[PDB]
Protein backbone atom coordinates (compact mmCIF):
# COMPACT_ATOMS: atom_id res chain seq x y z
CA UNK A 1 0.00 0.00 0.00
CA UNK A 2 1.23 3.40 -0.76
CA UNK A 3 1.41 6.16 1.99
CA UNK A 4 1.14 9.30 0.08
CA UNK A 5 0.17 12.28 2.88
CA UNK A 6 4.21 13.40 3.59
CA UNK A 7 3.67 14.91 -0.13
CA UNK A 8 0.64 17.35 0.03
CA UNK A 9 0.39 19.75 2.84
CA UNK A 10 -2.68 21.23 4.82
CA UNK A 11 -4.04 24.61 2.61
CA UNK A 12 -6.07 27.65 4.43
CA UNK A 13 -7.25 29.14 1.25
CA UNK A 14 -7.16 32.70 1.52
CA UNK A 15 -11.07 33.91 1.55
CA UNK A 16 -13.25 34.73 4.03
CA UNK A 17 -17.13 33.35 4.44
CA UNK A 18 -20.22 36.09 5.23
CA UNK A 19 -20.44 36.75 8.61
CA UNK A 20 -24.53 37.84 10.36
CA UNK A 21 -25.09 41.32 10.58
CA UNK A 22 -28.35 44.30 11.97
CA UNK A 23 -30.17 46.38 10.47
CA UNK A 24 -29.74 50.20 11.49
CA UNK A 25 -33.63 52.00 12.14
CA UNK A 26 -33.10 54.10 14.82
CA UNK A 27 -30.58 56.03 13.64
CA UNK A 28 -32.29 56.99 9.95
CA UNK A 29 -35.54 58.36 11.74
CA UNK A 30 -34.17 60.47 14.90
CA UNK A 31 -33.55 63.97 14.70
CA UNK A 32 -30.50 64.74 12.91
CA UNK A 33 -29.63 68.33 11.43
CA UNK A 34 -31.05 69.99 14.52
CA UNK A 35 -27.63 68.98 16.70
CA UNK A 36 -25.46 68.86 13.81
CA UNK A 37 -22.33 70.63 14.55
CA UNK A 38 -23.77 72.22 17.68
CA UNK A 39 -21.25 71.13 19.81
CA UNK A 40 -17.94 72.55 19.12
CA UNK A 41 -14.91 73.55 20.83
CA UNK A 42 -16.25 77.48 21.28
CA UNK A 43 -19.46 75.64 23.67
CA UNK A 44 -17.66 73.08 26.09
CA UNK A 45 -19.59 69.92 26.47
CA UNK A 46 -23.14 70.74 26.09
CA UNK A 47 -25.59 73.43 24.23
CA UNK A 48 -29.30 74.08 24.85
CA UNK A 49 -32.62 74.92 23.35
CA UNK A 50 -35.78 76.51 24.04
CA UNK A 51 -39.15 75.23 25.10
CA UNK A 52 -42.06 77.04 24.11
CA UNK A 53 -44.13 79.48 26.20
CA UNK B 1 -55.74 -23.92 -43.96
CA UNK B 2 -53.40 -21.60 -45.85
CA UNK B 3 -50.24 -21.33 -43.40
CA UNK B 4 -48.12 -17.97 -44.02
CA UNK B 5 -46.06 -16.99 -41.37
CA UNK B 6 -42.91 -17.67 -43.10
CA UNK B 7 -43.68 -15.08 -45.69
CA UNK B 8 -43.56 -11.92 -43.30
CA UNK B 9 -41.46 -11.08 -40.52
CA UNK B 10 -41.50 -9.51 -36.97
CA UNK B 11 -40.44 -6.10 -36.70
CA UNK B 12 -39.32 -4.32 -33.98
CA UNK B 13 -39.07 -0.25 -34.49
CA UNK B 14 -36.20 2.00 -34.10
CA UNK B 15 -38.21 4.33 -31.74
CA UNK B 16 -38.13 4.25 -27.93
CA UNK B 17 -40.98 4.53 -25.14
CA UNK B 18 -40.61 7.91 -22.80
CA UNK B 19 -39.07 7.05 -19.43
CA UNK B 20 -39.52 8.35 -15.98
CA UNK B 21 -37.58 11.89 -15.19
CA UNK B 22 -36.43 13.67 -12.05
CA UNK B 23 -35.47 17.64 -11.56
CA UNK B 24 -32.47 18.66 -9.86
CA UNK B 25 -33.03 21.64 -7.85
CA UNK B 26 -30.26 21.37 -5.26
CA UNK B 27 -27.28 21.09 -7.30
CA UNK B 28 -28.67 24.76 -9.11
CA UNK B 29 -28.99 26.66 -5.86
CA UNK B 30 -26.59 25.74 -3.34
CA UNK B 31 -22.78 27.81 -3.90
CA UNK B 32 -20.49 26.14 -6.64
CA UNK B 33 -17.71 29.38 -7.21
CA UNK B 34 -15.97 29.22 -4.27
CA UNK B 35 -15.09 25.38 -4.01
CA UNK B 36 -14.53 25.37 -7.52
CA UNK B 37 -10.74 24.41 -8.16
CA UNK B 38 -10.12 24.41 -4.93
CA UNK B 39 -8.82 21.16 -4.14
CA UNK B 40 -6.36 19.22 -6.86
CA UNK B 41 -3.16 17.22 -6.33
CA UNK B 42 -1.05 20.05 -4.38
CA UNK B 43 -3.95 20.02 -1.29
CA UNK B 44 -4.58 16.16 -0.26
CA UNK B 45 -8.30 15.34 0.50
CA UNK B 46 -9.72 18.48 1.89
CA UNK B 47 -9.37 22.28 2.10
CA UNK B 48 -10.09 25.03 4.68
CA UNK B 49 -11.70 28.46 4.37
CA UNK B 50 -11.44 31.10 6.86
CA UNK B 51 -13.96 31.93 9.67
CA UNK B 52 -14.83 35.60 9.87
CA UNK B 53 -13.79 37.50 13.54
Request: net charge negative; charged share 30%.
Given at each position: PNNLDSNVSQIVLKKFLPGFMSDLVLAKTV??????????SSTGDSVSFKRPH
Open positions: DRQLLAGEIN
